Amino acid sequence: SMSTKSVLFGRPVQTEGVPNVYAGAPVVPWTPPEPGIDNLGINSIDTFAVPGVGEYTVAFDGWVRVVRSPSTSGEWADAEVYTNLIEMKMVGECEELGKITVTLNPDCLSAGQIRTPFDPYAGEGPSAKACRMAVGAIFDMPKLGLKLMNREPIILTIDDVRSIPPAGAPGKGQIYRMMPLLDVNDPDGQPVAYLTSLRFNMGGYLKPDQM
Amino acid sequence: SMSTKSVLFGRPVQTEGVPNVYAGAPVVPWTPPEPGIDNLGINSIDTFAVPGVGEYTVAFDGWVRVVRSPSTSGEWADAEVYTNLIEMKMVGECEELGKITVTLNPDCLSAGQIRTPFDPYAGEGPSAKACRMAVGAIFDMPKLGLKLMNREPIILTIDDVRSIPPAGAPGKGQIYRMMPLLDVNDPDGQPVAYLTSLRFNMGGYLKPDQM
Ligand SMILES: CCCCCCCCCCCCCCCC(=O)O
Ligand SMILES: CCCCCCCCCCCCCCCC(=O)O
């Protein structure tokens, strides 16, 4: 494999020789872009269930860096783009759980793709694409003295994709009822908590000093 | 991890010394069972999208072997059970795709759990549990000269669980729009096909010679 990661959640994408894209760069709709690493803002709302203890909803803000493969075509209708999520930092705060910092698990390749869906029956603009990303994350919860991780990838989706990157777009975590979160120090143990829902919005390109 | 597999989709469960359970063994509702390996029938209906070629719906029949951990309690309400899917074989056939045989990917630990949901549905009541399994599979398609595998786990769920095992129960694959299926001989390549939907039914205990 082209990846050194121990667990791959999708297709590896090269970053060497791929330029970073920052604020100032246009987002042109319906246009397959040249390969780049998108430096993008993001916010989310995450709900966590702690068995026998409680359920907590936490708002997060931060950024992601996502490398894109070259498009498989210069024509939008045929174009596919493969992505890797290569760096993240999101922060949120909560009285009960403290300050939570979400980053990537270095043992996992977080990977996704953008392509025409097989079920274009959702009211999306004509020709719009579907974006997905499968993520291995770390949830640092210092107030609880814990760091948590997921073995099952968190599936994050953006529908009605009319530009790449889909700046400004709303997305969802596809979690059916519960997603186990494991103590990094006891990953073969019982889950410590469950992520029960996640919604997010993409922002736009950031300046380097905003990260 | 105590599991030697390179990709872990959940919690490992002990199999050594755990007896097999076969037809004849009763399934009494509301009763956490002693640890065992359930030998169960199963059927499913799977839809596959092959880009630029077609979409095909195929019915499968076969069996699964699922090991259960000891229950965390002898009282149903408190009981949780952890599971691993340790062996399977399902077969279906389709003119365009040929005979398809589904087995486990030996590199992946397929793992799940049964516990009370945090969000019980109106038709579940406060006593029913929810069952989930995260699966790494192989799809053998000799007609096409290919074997395919998934990197994102196939999330298989059963709601309104009132017995363990949930013999006879309907279940669903929680696949959002598309699940990439990769050539085992080109696993970092573009997907060959996508699993776009899956539903299944659990059968009951099988005789040893029915597998
Ligand atoms: C545990 C919470 C994780 C949230 C992390 C956000 C996931 C990434 C956002 C959705 C996919 C991003 C797609 C951008 C693709 C592109 O750069 O063109
Ligand atoms: C293409 C993938 C097909 C996979 C088919 C799913 C196999 C059945 C697993 C569903 C959960 C099993 C629950 C049984 C639990 C128990 O033994 O008590």
Residue numbers in the entry:
A (entry chain A), B (entry chain B): 0 to 210
Give the exact sentences the study uses for this entry.
In natural environments, some microorganisms producing enediynes protect themselves from their cytotoxic action by a self-resistance mechanism that uses a self-sacrificing protein or specialized ABC transporters to export the toxin.
Access to the biosynthetic gene cluster of dynemicin has enabled the in vitro study of gene products within the cluster to decipher their roles in assembling this unique molecule. The DynF crystal has two molecules in its asymmetric unit. DynF is comprised of antiparallel β-sheets that are connected by short loops and helical segments to form eight-stranded antiparallel β-barrels. The size and shape of the ligand, as well as its binding environment, are suggestive of a 16-carbon fatty acid, which was confirmed by gas chromatography–mass spectrometry (GC-MS) as palmitic acid.
